[PDB]
Design a protein around this ligand. Structure first.
Ligand SMILES: Nc1ncnc2c1ncn2[C@@H]1O[C@H](COP(=O)(O)OP(=O)(O)O)[C@@H](O)[C@H]1O
Ligand SMILES: Nc1ncnc2c1ncn2[C@@H]1O[C@H](COP(=O)(O)OP(=O)(O)O)[C@@H](O)[C@H]1O
Ligand SMILES: Nc1ncnc2c1ncn2[C@@H]1O[C@H](COP(=O)(O)OP(=O)(O)O)[C@@H](O)[C@H]1O
Ligand SMILES: [Mg+2]
Ligand SMILES: [Mg+2]
Ligand SMILES: [Mg+2]
Ligand SMILES: [Zn+2]
Lengths: 565, 621, 621
DNA sequence: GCATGCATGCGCATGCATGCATTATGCATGCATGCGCATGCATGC
DNA sequence: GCATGCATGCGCATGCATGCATAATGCATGCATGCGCATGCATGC
């Protein structure tokens, strides 16, 4: 064991030392600038990398890994001691909490002489005056672990995990230190909290009440108290790491002030945390002794082009898929044996926000939302808000699910009115559907693609060659960039000029006239014109042009013609 | 407590006896290599055969079975001594090691229904199924605290179940110094061990008909935490003890009995190389021929079943795409063509085999379900038949009686091999990679020859495309074929097991020739033994072949030839449509044949065999 | 209790400091040889100078004086470490060793009257007299028991005063087995340590006049059991602590304070060989001359006092007969002849000297007494002045005022040297070998010259025969003798101690010459230093001379000559009768002179000196 | 030497600080299961 | 495809074994010392 004073001094010198890294290509005092910002209310939390510390001392890193909480507290105290040195000016604008801190420090200077004896209980709690939080970043050398294998050997260690989010709690304030005022004195009493539950005090420990033996009684205050942001997270294993025949395991995470509001249900996250237990008191058990429940305390959470190049053919369908991803509802009907499911899988993997449903497995409560112990939790349609949703084997779905899907496509909101639930849910998502061989699809959807397997010898032979190549060389014959391109594209919004309207109008009229000439035609309406306008706007957005052009309209017309034929 | 013991004849003698038991110097014992293996694998417990101990020292075995705790303590002390002797450095890591038990306990082999107070404080063996499991929880053993006021650290030791009875003086968590200075707990320096509780029920197959079941409660310590799961058939060997109730004045006199586990069991080269290298094609030839002597003929179905046993190759790519590697078969035939016998044989031979008939299991019991746990309010997943049979076999008898929705549910398993589950509050993707056997009767009771197979089968094209192979079996009443069948059946009927007296009531690579089971003519050939067959099947399943450039163009050209012959086949009808899945089926069967003969690459002969199978199955007269 | 301590800066640093204190490698320290002496003598405690510790390490001394128990524990641990280091074999015998303290404590030097609560928990030094003592009693430390029913032996450890506070769980004697089988105590295998309690009172000489005394209670452990006795002046160094009262509900708030002793003290070659061998006769010549410069003349009395200091030889024979070896003297003289000065000087110089005047002590307080102890009802013996002065000196001033019965009592001591005591229930023979000085005034105030000495002395012949020597001193008023006396007295009066300023208020073998204390004429001779004189006297008292054949016949013939001259001495009277004791006196004085000059045998010159002394003392003009 | 004085000595009562002996009953909590309700799935015709 | 049946499913009440919380007073014993008694020692005259 080593004395904490020496390591505290080492921490202080490490914070004062580093000059190395700068983004603009120079040598910049990073931690000094961070501390100067911390001096005032220009930064309310600080993150420390354990890769930068590894340059000078690895034993510090190991001791931090095995005894993380103590080192977190030591770091907090060291930074708090360093703060007065770097301070250069008073606060330009301050809020209520700063007003208490300043007033308390001012009267502490007013009253306390340097020589008088002060009881250990007479000091201010450290965390009450402090207003900055310290968190750690996991070592790059350290390998992320699996939820299944963290056990009693890992209690108290520093770990890094990767998982899928399933449950998130709404933000609520959590008590840190409670403040009490006596009934017959001007003194203030502070009660730190480090337990799930606590018992409020009654009598006043202040010196004046003790000397007079007045028996004054304490009262809580909320303004003087310190509160923090608190969230609760549920994570599960990836399907890849589950052993044979088992079921994914779950873990619970707790989230602090600035880390709050980072993750959403359904996201894949990487969490740097400390593995700590909770002493459990409750119903009696078989085995005597001290049992506990484990949980994780987080300190950092981190979340034309070729589309599905493995699948041969369907180039126009791929262009339509690109347009749907870029944005301004697509349905595919095909014979069995044509890979429609794999296109939907690729779409789900590519999209940032996406969901993929297979049929009756996610039917009913899997869609819409339900009430659970009370909080309302949404289904796939709710999760895919402002994303893209994918549905396979559409015709096999129950009628209620199809009605809900139609409502989402047309109205873009869901309405639920049943015993215990009365809500309207926002679902601004575009739908891609797959099915096997109706007027509803033609009337409601925007674009339908019919894939018929005509046994042409040349096409079949080329498909066979491509499949053999894929199976043998495990690569197509000769996503991050695509995601970045789509993100940059969606930033702009082109506009339709006044003149082109006439041209568009003419086209529409002529199209309808042809549809009226061909009595075998089925649907033309203003919805088709709206779809054409949306496709042209999407193409103009792809060109990053401010004004809609002729080529976009021609390509949209050609795509609609190809789909209809 | 300052009380100490100076002499104890029984304990010292028992320790000496175990020391002599585990020496293995002047004997053919193996425990030395077992200890070396434990040191190599960083594990900290040993399993010792009870029958071996009884053979070497019967008195010690009798005492251990009759009295458990003290003898087990002596065992653990002897293990500590010998681990220190062989390598004292490794013994520093762990406090104390543990002993497992194994062998035929005899009279103490006891069912959960027959556990009684007569077996208390002894070591018992029990066979059952697991019904309830609990979350893993840590328990404190050694606690460490630090005092910022005085810069002093202290440590407290805990021992609760080490001693039979505990007192309020122990199990007290320290929080304050001698001068009331606060202490700060330091979780890194403390010591914890895992703890779990499970429940075991007598298997419904063994329980008397019409009677309610009986169950036992088991505690799993730090090592055996993850060794059990609900819905599992296990055998547990351990002590049977009473449970001390907490302090009180008046007691009713009824204790709680809990079984403390010590062993948990999941009940279940030159020859191979020479045989494979010498035989090559004859490997699969004999394996197909010697699949099941009890079944007469049907070489194609035997070949297909062997292809299921060997299987294809699972492949993955950069984009996360998944390509199926399993095979699926559907048999349709007239009654009494021994389809169910084939299914039962595949159940017996395959490692992970589950039978699920048509209406025996519904769509929920096939894949999985979600249930709300009343104890906590959370959502939990319960696995179905197909999820349990990961990388295994599911047999479906009377496949035609299955409802449409169940088949739509099975689509997800048959296409991609995964199951997607979702209900508000939880959603998951479970792995269900599996292979399916199915047997379905014709719609008209007996297969009509004149009508095309589409009318007789009565199944949609999508479901047919889901299956890799379709086979049709008929009972042709040829007098010579009937004579052969009668000969075979009566030869099997007249046979009696060797070593059993007549009239009573009730490993070589190649099986020994039998006068009746094989016949005089078959002396020129032999059949492969079942055990070697299983070993070879496992080895072949391990092997990973690769496709060659010679056969890819050949297979592609033949696929194009079939899709063009679609117009040429005018004299006969087609059983199944030809889609993109047919090419994958060709490659899969080629790889299965390449697995049959141990090699490194897929050759042309495997492609030819696959194509022969496809041509036979896909068209009928 | 499983609680343990991992780090403690203060205790570890203090142990390191004591380790460096007791190294004595790069220093002139002696403690290594002290430890070797302890190992040689089988003793198990050490005495360390406090001033030495303060010189080497002042902070440790300050902490030890201010805080005792923890620092003493650290000392004992360091002793165990170094005893193990030097010789680990010897450290096995004893559990833990102990530390004594010595040196000038300074402010903490405290009288029993000035002990206060301010010195609690510190190490204090106290000077006092012993008044009450108790019987030695054993105390159990480690207990061992055996069970004939199960043939098992157990051991229990006890620690009562090792810990500050004890609880009912400890200090319980085991009597039954876990199955109620009786246990048999085996006293041989157990461990016991002795225990005693004494009481100390402030000495009456130091207490303020007219005030009642105050006392302290002391506990003596196993080593210091027999180191104290009642009626003894001692100095005790030890801890001053409170006494924990036994359990109760309501407490008055007054503790009992008891001093726990750690040290108990009874307050008190080439040169010698060369001086003796060179001087021979000059040894006793100078010793007689340099006996006391403060006293003028009287060479015969100085010779006699020197003979007392050296003494005779005690002899024993086969039949158990005892022969006296002590000498006794009586001085009678006119007032102001400095008899009391001689008595006081003999008190100062002699090792065991006790003054007992005529009526100051009675016959009971001289020899001994028997008292009935009210606590037990038994009979106990209390020693008197003469029993305490075994092999010592008793000085009796104003011997004439002593009553007759006291002198009859002193007869037993003077003749045989033993005291016989008897009262129904007890009888004993105590040893009282001793020598007596006595000074008595003449009956007529001033010695009458014309009357015979028998009238002036007024003592019976038996008592005179009891004494070895009689001397008569007179104040003759010769002008030159008076001038010499005045010179000597005023020279002594004008003298002042060197190093003391005038007008202020209030080792070499031969003493340095002084201008006034010796004089200019005496430069040709020197006087012997007091310390060397005491050392030589002790060495001479050790030496055991033997009588030669040359002098025995000579002494016998001279004794016969004296007993015949009894008729020849017509011009002078006889002071003392001549009996058989005179011959023993001759031999005794001869042996004393032979002791004066270190040799092996008694020679003729010693006999001649003895006879000169006898002739001078026994007759007067 | 005999007559008298008298400091020492012993046994049983009370007063006062510490110390010793005694000792079941009533109320609260979690596990098991009935009873009313709405959703939802499956099965006919 | 629409009308009906219905095995599954959920939330709040009571009943019953274990388990939890409470909580000074009166009587006995050894140490200190007074008061009556007989023996015995020492001191005069
Ligand atoms: N154009 C294509 N290119 C490559 N592979 C294809 C193509 N069409 C079909 N496949 C293969 O055929 C299989 C089709 O199965 P699936 O997509 O599940 O059919 P469906 O989606 O109609 O149920 C896929 O595994 C895929 O590998
Ligand atoms: N090829 C065959 N070889 C041996 N026995 C056969 C054969 N075909 C039929 N059998 C006999 O006929 C019976 C058929 O029963 P089963 O397998 O239940 O027929 P299915 O499954 O067609 O209803 C079996 O008991 C079997 O002994
Ligand atoms: N021979 C001597 N030498 C020195 N001083 C003497 C001598 N004789 C007598 N004195 C003095 O005379 C005093 C006699 O007092 P002290 O000894 O009490 O006489 P005594 O003992 O005879 O009554 C002493 O103080 C001493 O100083
Ligand atoms: Mg599909
Ligand atoms: Mg059958
Ligand atoms: Mg005198
Ligand atoms: Zn107050």
């Amino acid at each position: 064991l080593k004395d904490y004073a020496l390591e505290k001094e080492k921490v202080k010198k490490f914070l004062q030392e580093f000059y190395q890294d700068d983004e603009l290509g120079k040598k910049q005092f990073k931690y000094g600038n961070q501390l100067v910002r911390l001096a005032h209310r220009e930064q309310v939390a600080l993150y420390v990398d354990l890769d930068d510390v590894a340059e000078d001392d690895p034993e510090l890193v190991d001791s931090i890994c095995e005894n993380a909480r103590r080192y977190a507290k030591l770091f907090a105290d060291a930074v708090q001691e360093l703060l007065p040195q770097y301070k250069e000016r008073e606060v330009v604008n301050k809020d209520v909490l700063d007003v208490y801190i300043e007033h308390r420090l001012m009267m502490e200077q007013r009253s306390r002489d340097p020589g008088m004896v002060r009881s250990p209980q007479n000091q201010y709690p450290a965390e009450l005056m402090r207003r900055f939080e310290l968190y750690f970043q996991g070592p790059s050398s350290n390998k992320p672990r699996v939820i299944r294998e963290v056990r009693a050997d890992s209690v108290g260690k520093l770990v890094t995990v990767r998982g899928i989010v399933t449950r998130v709690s709404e933000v609520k304030p959590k008590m840190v230190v409670a403040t009490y005022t006596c009934d017959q004195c001007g003194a203030e009493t502070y009660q730190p909290i480090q337990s799930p539950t606590f018992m409020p005090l009654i009598m006043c420990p202040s010196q004046e009440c003790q000397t007079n033996r007045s028996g004054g009684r304490l009262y809580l205050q909320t303004r003087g108290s310190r509160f923090i942001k608190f969230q609760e997270m549920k994570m599960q294993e990836h399907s890849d790491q589950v052993p044979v025949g088992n079921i994914p395991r779950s873990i619970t995470v707790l989230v602090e002030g600035e880390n709050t509001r980072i993750a959403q249900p359904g996201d894949h996250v990487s969490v740097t945390g400390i593995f700590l237990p909770i002493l459990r008191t409750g119903f009696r058990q078989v085995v005597q002794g001290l049992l506990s429940e484990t949980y994780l305390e987080a300190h950092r959470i981190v979340k034309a082009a070729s589309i599905a190049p493995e699948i041969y053919g369907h180039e126009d369908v791929k262009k339509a898929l690109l347009l749907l991803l870029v944005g301004g509802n697509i349905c595919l009907m095909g014979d069995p044996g044509v890979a429609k499911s794999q296109l939907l899988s690729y779409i789900d993997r590519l999209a940032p926000r996406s969901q993929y449903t297979t049929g009756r497995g996610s039917s009913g409560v899997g869609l819409t939302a339900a009430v659970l112990r009370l909080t309302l939790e949404g289904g796939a349609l709710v999760l895919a808000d402002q994303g893209v949703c994918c549905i396979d084997e559409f015709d096999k779905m129950a009628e209620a699910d199809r009605t809900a899907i139609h409502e989402v496509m047309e109205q873009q909101t869901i309405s639920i009115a049943k015993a215990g639930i009365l809500t309207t849910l926002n679902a601004r998502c575009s739908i891609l559907a797959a099915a096997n061989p109706p007027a509803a699809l033609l009337s409601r959807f925007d674009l339908l693609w019919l894939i018929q397997d005509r046994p042409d010898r040349d096409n079949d032979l080329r498909l066979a060659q491509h499949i053999t190549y894929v199976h043998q060389h495990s690569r197509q014959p000769p996503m991050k960039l695509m995601r970045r391109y789509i993100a940059m594209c969606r930033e702009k919004q082109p506009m339709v000029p006044e003149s082109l309207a006439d041209y568009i109008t003419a086209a529409y009229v002529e199209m309808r006239r042809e549809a009226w000439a061909s009595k075998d035609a089925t649907y033309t309406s203003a919805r088709t014109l709206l779809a054409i306008l949306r496709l042209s706007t999407a193409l103009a957005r792809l060109r990053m042009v401010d004004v809609v052009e002729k080529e976009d309209v021609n390509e949209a017309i050609r795509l609609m013609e190809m789909s209809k034929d | 407590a300052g009380t100490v013991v100076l002499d104890d004849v029984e304990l010292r003698e028992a320790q000496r006896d175990y020391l002599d038991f585990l020496d293995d110097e002047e004997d053919q014992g193996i425990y030395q290599s077992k200890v070396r293996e434990l040191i190599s694998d960083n594990q900290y417990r040993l399993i010792v055969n009870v029958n071996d101990l009884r053979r070497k020292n019967e008195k010690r075995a009798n005492r251990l079975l009759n009295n458990a705790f003290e003898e087990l303590v002596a065992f653990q002390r002897a293990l500590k001594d010998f681990v220190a002797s062989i390598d004292a450095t490794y013994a520093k890591q762990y406090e104390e090691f543990y002993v497992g038990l194994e062998g035929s306990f005899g009279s103490k082999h006891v069912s959960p229904r027959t556990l009684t107070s007569c077996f208390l404080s002894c070591v018992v063996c029990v066979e059952g199924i697991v019904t309830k499991c609990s979350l893993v929880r840590p328990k404190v053993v050694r606690s460490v605290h630090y005092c910022p006021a005085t810069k002093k650290t202290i440590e407290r030791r805990y021992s609760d179940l080490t001693t039979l009875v505990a007192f309020p003086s122990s199990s007290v968590y320290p929080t304050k110094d001698e001068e009331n200075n606060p202490l700060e707990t330091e979780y890194g320096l403390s010591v914890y061990k895992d703890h779990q509780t499970i429940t075991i029920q007598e298997m419904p197959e063994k329980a008397p008909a019409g009677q309610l079941p009986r169950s036992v409660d088991v505690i799993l310590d730090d090592d055996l935490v993850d060794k059990a799961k609900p819905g599992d058939r296990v055998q547990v060997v351990g002590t049977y003890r009473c449970l001390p109730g907490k302090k009180g004045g008046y007691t009713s006199g009824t204790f709680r009995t809990v079984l403390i586990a010590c062993n948990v069991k999941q009940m279940s080269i030159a020859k191979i190389k020479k045989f494979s290298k010498t035989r090559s094609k004859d490997i699969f030839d004999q394996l197909a021929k010697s699949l099941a002597p009890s079944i007469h003929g049907h070489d194609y179905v035997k070949k297909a079943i062997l292809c299921l046993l060997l299987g294809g190759v699972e492949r993955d790519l950069e984009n996360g795409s998944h390509i199926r590697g399993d095979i699926n078969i559907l048999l349709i035939g007239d009654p009494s063509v021994a389809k169910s016998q084939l299914l039962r044989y595949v159940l017996c031979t395959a490692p992970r085999a589950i039978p699920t008939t048509g209406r025996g299991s519904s769509g929920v019991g096939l894949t999985a379900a979600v249930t709300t746990d009343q104890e906590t309010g959370e959502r939990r997943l319960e696995a179905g038949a197909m999820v349990l049979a990961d990388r295994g076999v599911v047999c479906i008898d009377e496949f035609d009686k299955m409802s449409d929705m169940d088949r739509t549910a099975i689509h997800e398993v048959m296409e991609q091999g995964r199951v997607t589950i979702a209900k508000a509050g939880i959603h998951a993707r479970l792995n269900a990679r599996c292979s399916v056997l199915a047997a379905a009767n014709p719609v008209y009771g007996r297969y009509d020859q004149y009508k095309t197979p589409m009318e007789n089968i009565g199944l949609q094209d999508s479901l047919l495309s889901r299956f890799d192979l379709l086979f049709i079996m008929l009972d042709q009443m040829d007098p010579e074929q009937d004579r052969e069948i009668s000969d075979h059946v009566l030869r099997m009927h007249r046979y009696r097991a060797p070593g059993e007296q007549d009239g009573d009531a009730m490993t070589q690579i190649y099986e020994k020739h039998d006068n009746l089971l094989h016949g005089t003519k078959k002396k020129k050939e032999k059949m492969v033994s079942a055990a070697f067959m299983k070993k070879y099947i496992h080895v072949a399943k391990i092997i990973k072949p690769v496709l060659t450039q010679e056969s890819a163009t050949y297979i592609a050209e033949e696929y194009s030839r079939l899709r063009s012959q679609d117009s040429m086949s005018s004299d006969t009808a087609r059983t199944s449509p030809v889609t993109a899945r047919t090419l994958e089926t060709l490659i899969r069967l080629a790889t299965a044949h390449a697995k049959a003969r141990m090699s490194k690459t897929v050759d042309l002969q495997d492609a030819e065999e696959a194509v022969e199978l496809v041509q036979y199955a896909y068209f009928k007269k």
